[PDB]
Design a protein around this nucleic acid. Structure first.
Lengths: 140, 163, 194, 33, 118, 106
RNA sequence: GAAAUUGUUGAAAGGAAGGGCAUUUGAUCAGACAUGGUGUUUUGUUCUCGCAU
RNA sequence: GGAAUACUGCCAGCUGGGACUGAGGACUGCGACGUAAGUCAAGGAUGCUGGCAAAUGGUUAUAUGCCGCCGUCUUGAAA
RNA sequence: AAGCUCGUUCAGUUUUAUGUAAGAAUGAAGCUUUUAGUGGGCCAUUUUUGGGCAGAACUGGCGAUGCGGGAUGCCGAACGUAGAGUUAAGGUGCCGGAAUACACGCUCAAGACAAAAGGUGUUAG
RNA sequence: GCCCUGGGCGCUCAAGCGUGUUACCUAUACUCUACCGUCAGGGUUGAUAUGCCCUGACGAGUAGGCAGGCGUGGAGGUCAGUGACGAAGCCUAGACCGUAAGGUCGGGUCGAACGGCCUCUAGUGCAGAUCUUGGUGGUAGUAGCAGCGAAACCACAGCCAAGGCGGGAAUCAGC
RNA sequence: UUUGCUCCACACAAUAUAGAUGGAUACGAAUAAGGCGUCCUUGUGGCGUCGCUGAACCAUAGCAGGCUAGCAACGGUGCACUUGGCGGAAAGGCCUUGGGUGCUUGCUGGCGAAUUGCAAUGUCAUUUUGCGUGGGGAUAAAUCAUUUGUAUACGACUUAGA
């Protein structure tokens, strides 16, 4: 095999994705649910939180291309997401750490969510389309 | 969208000059060469186009009752015709005349000769009623049976044509 | 889009209406036509009548041409020539079409629709002659026009009372909204577009 | 083995015409009179 | 591995023109509107359908099929086991088939048509 | 919420074709609401899914789905060309289709 | 012990079909024959020198 | 007196959305980055991830979108 | 096809000489010798013949010719098997894949050989 | 200028006419790339060869010419080839390979000899020939002699609107 | 035909969709005018005003939508009943009185969501048919035969009979 000259350039994320932004998932068991972006992982996935205590969505890895960006942002500076890593999702039934870490993460974000009025209930409600909707026109 | 150009020639002198209306300088040069044969006996290889320059309207913000003398080659010879057109610029006035000729007499750019265009600054000078009617004092008239482009295939209100 | 669309033939043009209905049918949309007896065709009565009478005698010989009298069937024939009939796709498309004189039930209690680009008044130049189709059908052999009008007259009645009741209900709703105005919720909705 | 297209792929564009670097570094394409 | 997508170009095997209508006509391709390659007619085999050299004669498993009928023939593939697979002829008795299969397995040569008469 | 829809609905018209020649490798898909190619530009690259039911139970379920993609716009009415790994059957002319919102960029 | 031709059973559909381009449905099948590839200790003519592993 | 703007042409200007293509096969060649090691979009794709014991797909029947009896003959290609 | 030997010699290519010494342009060879087949008319054109018609000196095209368009029999374009994008002819109300697109007027019955003549039919110099 | 006397549906501020301005539909045409082949140029052996390669162009076609291949009968040499533990032949809606003449494999019958390779050899490849020999269908349980059982004919067609010379079960009564 | 036939309740399968994935979300009449609210000296009337698109209206928050606590009203609404009216064009639907029973996101809280591992429509509609029980309802008709003679080429047609 010849020496292919293709360097692993780091991923470039679209400007519409910023930490603390409200994300919407279009695929998966949580499709249609509203989630909060936290950190970008080395595997090109997005670390997000429901938070779990609000809508039941735990910390999960998601792909940007399947996520619709929104202008609504919330503070995420107080959450120490450095603990999470790609190795934190390997498996080779819920693990004990998955509960305590999720609770700790949600404790530092439930207050911020409650700071903005109607944001808790807004996240608790699953997003869905309606008759006559025109996503291209809508800003989301 | 026509354009006005001034083209001169002298067969390599008298420096024959005329005004040519064309969509581009290339067509203007061809029309000038064609008109040279009609005006006098000259050929393309005889000389060269001394200068060609586009002429822009001095002020395309004023309504002018342009008087135009146009000669066209009908199916049975060529006849001299004169008309008056109300417009804002010579470029639009000549285009309107061309469209009117093509609609009625079916004369087109191939067989239409533009002689002279001049504005009319005094009332009662225009002898054509279709232009004379617009030279009166500030008037008002409606636009009955107006229509709207309904993008949607279906309508539920039974649209009305009122204005 | 509604599962089924009802089109009011009143003040419409046979040609454009048939073309648009056929195009929608080919796309897989169910459409129904009502008040077909009031449809209109461009040109004076004599021209349209002659164009139809000549058709009745053009021969294939009864296997081909049929002296079909119903105006709804005439409209269907007009739309028939705009569809790829005699094939599975075209025949299936025609299955989603129904034409009835007047407005029989249960279509009466449902919102009818009109095609803005197929309106006879909108597209036909004012002052020019036009044909009402009903007279043509009556002259060519149709005899149900009198009964159609008689039982359509009852359609306007009762429906008028229903409209009056709906008008009273909307009056009450408008009064409730007017007295509801100036509320905090209303002010917030107005500020946020709604 | 593969025909690199100039204009695009600026790396190959620099292979030919070394003056392209100076042209891009001096905005000569929009030089004022 | 060196088993890239093998494009057959034309999977449908050609059939003799009008062979379906008449029984006497065999399906073996034979030249004669077909000669004029009119629209809506069967295509004529031509040089355009040539398979790539690097993948010609290769089975979907990415190995050449080599007929074998003796121990020496199977052993000859010992050097070319990576590319050539063994294939037992239909005339080989079941008695020698066991020995051939055992030798192929011991030398790593794959058998295209195992279980024959077993 | 009563409505769980997350894909833009549409219709299937016919494959790319001429007066007498039709190529099923390209399918013309109409998207509800779209009117001009400019609006359809947003739907480019979106996966198109067709859902149909069969009596036999396939390996995973009773539902079978085809996974396609959008290629480019078509016409002045906003029609968009759709390509599938397996071309849709001709019987589905005029049938509805599902256009998902991913992959997205907004 | 082959074809035209005909008899039992199973799939089929509505003044006609076999033919060509791409797909689904029903049936059916090669189905990857992966047998592979990585480094040690246990016992006998101290031991992985090599055999069951 | 002054700019602006429509139009034309240039950018070896920038920034995206979408479609097909991965073809070559250990390094030798022309170039950019760098004070040097070395790096690069620089004579053809790499890195990661998920579903799988029928997987993908093949022949065939039937229905859908479009297309459509043979050799010799006069020889004007023709019935 | 068959030997030589010159790599240059050639052209259905284009103006001044008066048809050319062309150190004018553009493109890129010769003698042989024997070896299968080859004896048609025609569409359009040319020379432009006379009184309907009949031969005719000529220049482009088939015969051996697919494909898109014209419902079907001149225009485009001349052909390996495939993926991707733009077009020719011809089209964008449906059959039929494409805008019931914009702008200037026309027309009441048409519209996709009769023009010799009339209309108190309609609109312009 | 247009009208009157002189492809189907339909169209009438056209979906008719002339013209101007943008967009779109798609041929085997054009542009980029994957593959086969021919034609042209070149590298090649102090061994890497009628070979292993690199680069470009080209791909219509009757008669005709040249080149390259499969297959059947027989013969010379070889596979110290296959085969009663089943070879030849036959069927396969099972698969593989060669784009091609075809080859291979698994399965149902089979019961006595055959296959590849380098060559030689010819009574060597069928859809036609109102072809030959043999067999078999509709006609048809029809005329026929409740009987007994054919012949003629048979590519396949037919319900008509017109031009490129072509808009439905079954039997009984008229020509 | 071991409820055989039929309409229902629950109950397991096959069968497929010309193709749901919130709502066909009801006047008439004119298009060189019509509504809407009001006035009334009631009319083809006066006054304010609406169009120029549905780019809207009704709804839409909960494990695809659960449990439970508190506040304000007895409004909204899913569903089993009941008094009554309207709809005969293809009426087969529209409702209306009264309570009963869930929810109510109108407002404020406590509970579980994870593992489908970064997605594989991630299965929720009925069209028809088949088999298993219980809640009722009724228990007939036609052909041949026999014959008729208005009919009658032969069919056919028209009859009488437990």
């Amino acid at each position: 095999l010849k020496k292919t000259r293709k360097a692993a350039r780091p991923q470039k994320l679209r400007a519409s994705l910023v930490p603390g932004t409200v994300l919407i998932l279009l695929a998966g068991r949580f499709r249609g649910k509203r989630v909060v972006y936290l950190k970008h992982l080395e595997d090109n996935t997005l670390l997000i939180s429901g938070p779990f205590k609000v809508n039941g969505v735990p910390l999960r890895r998601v792909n940007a291309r399947y996520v619709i960006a929104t202008s609504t942002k919330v503070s995420v500076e107080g959450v120490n997401v450095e603990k999470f890593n790609v190795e934190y999702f390997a498996k080779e039934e819920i693990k004990a750490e998955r509960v305590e870490d999720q609770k700790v993460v949600d404790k530092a974000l439930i207050a911020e969510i409650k700071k903005t009025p109607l944001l808790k209930q807004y996240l608790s409600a699953s997003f869905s389309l309606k008759n006559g909707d025109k996503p291209h026109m809508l800003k989301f | 969208h026509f354009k006005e150009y001034q083209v001169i020639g002298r067969r390599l002198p008298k420096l024959f000059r005329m005004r040519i209306f064309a969509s581009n300088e290339v067509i203007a040069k061809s029309r000038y060469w064609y008109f040279l044969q009609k005006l006098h006996k000259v050929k393309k290889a005889s000389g060269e186009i001394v200068s060609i320059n586009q002429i822009n309207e001095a002020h395309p913000t004023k309504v002018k009752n342009f008087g135009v003398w146009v000669r066209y080659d009908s199916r049975s010879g060529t006849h001299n015709m004169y008309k008056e057109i109300r417009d804002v610029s010579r470029v639009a006035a000549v285009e309107t005349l061309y469209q009117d000729m093509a609609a009625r007499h079916r004369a087109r750019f191939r067989s239409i000769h533009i002689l002279k265009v001049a504005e009319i600054e005094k009332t009662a000078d225009v002898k054509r009623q279709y232009v004379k009617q617009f030279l009166t004092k500030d008037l008002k008239f409606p636009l009955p049976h107006r229509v709207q482009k309904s993008t949607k295939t279906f309508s539920y209100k039974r649209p009305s044509t009122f204005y | 889009v509604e599962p089924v669309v009802v089109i009011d033939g009143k003040g419409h043009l046979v040609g454009r209406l048939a073309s648009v209905v056929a195009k929608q049918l080919l796309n897989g949309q169910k459409i129904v036509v009502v008040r077909a007896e009031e449809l209109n065709i461009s040109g004076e009565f004599f021209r349209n009548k002659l164009k139809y009478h000549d058709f009745l005698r053009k021969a294939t010989k009864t296997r081909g041409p049929f002296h079909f009298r119903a105006p709804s069937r005439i409209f269907y024939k007009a739309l028939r020539g705009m569809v790829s009939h005699k094939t599975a796709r075209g025949k299936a498309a025609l299955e989603r079409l129904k034409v009835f004189e007047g407005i029989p039930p249960p279509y009466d209690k449902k919102k009818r629709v009109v095609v803005p680009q197929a309106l006879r008044v909108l597209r036909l130049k004012p002052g020019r002659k036009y044909t009402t189709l009903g007279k043509l059908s009556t002259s060519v052999g149709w005899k149900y026009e009198d009964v159609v009008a008689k039982l359509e007259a009852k359609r306007k009645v009762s429906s008028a009372e229903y409209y009056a009741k709906k008008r009273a209900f909307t009056k009450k709703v408008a009064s409730a909204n007017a007295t509801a105005a100036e509320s905090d919720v209303a002010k917030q909705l107005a500020a946020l577009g709604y | 083995v593969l025909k690199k297209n100039p204009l695009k792929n600026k790396q190959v564009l620099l292979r030919l015409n070394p003056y392209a670097k100076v042209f891009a570094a001096e905005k000569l394409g929009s030089k004022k009179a | 591995l060196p088993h890239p997508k093998i494009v057959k170009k034309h999977t449908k095997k050609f059939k003799r023109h009008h062979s379906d209508r008449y029984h006497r006509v065999a399906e073996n391709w034979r030249k004669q509107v077909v000669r004029r390659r009119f629209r809506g007619n069967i295509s004529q085999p031509k040089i355009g359908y040539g398979s790539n050299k690097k993948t010609k004669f290769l089975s979907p498993s990415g190995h050449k099929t080599f007929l074998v009928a003796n121990v020496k023939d199977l052993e000859t593939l010992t050097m070319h086991t990576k590319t050539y697979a063994a294939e037992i002829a239909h005339n080989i008795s079941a008695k020698n088939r066991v020995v051939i299969l055992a030798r192929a397995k011991a030398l790593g040569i794959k058998v295209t048509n195992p279980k024959g008469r077993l | 919420a009563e409505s769980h829809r997350l894909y833009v609905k549409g219709k299937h018209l016919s494959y790319q074709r001429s007066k007498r020649v039709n190529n099923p490798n390209v399918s013309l898909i109409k998207i509800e609401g779209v009117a001009t190619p400019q609006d359809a530009q947003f739907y480019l690259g979106k996966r198109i899914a067709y859902v149909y039911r069969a009596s036999k139970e396939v390996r995973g379920s009773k539902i079978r789905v085809m996974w396609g993609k959008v290629t480019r716009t078509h016409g002045n009415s906003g029609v968009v060309r759709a390509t599938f790994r397996n071309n849709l059957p001709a019987k589905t002319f005029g049938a509805s289709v599902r256009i998902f919102l991913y992959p997205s960029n907004i």
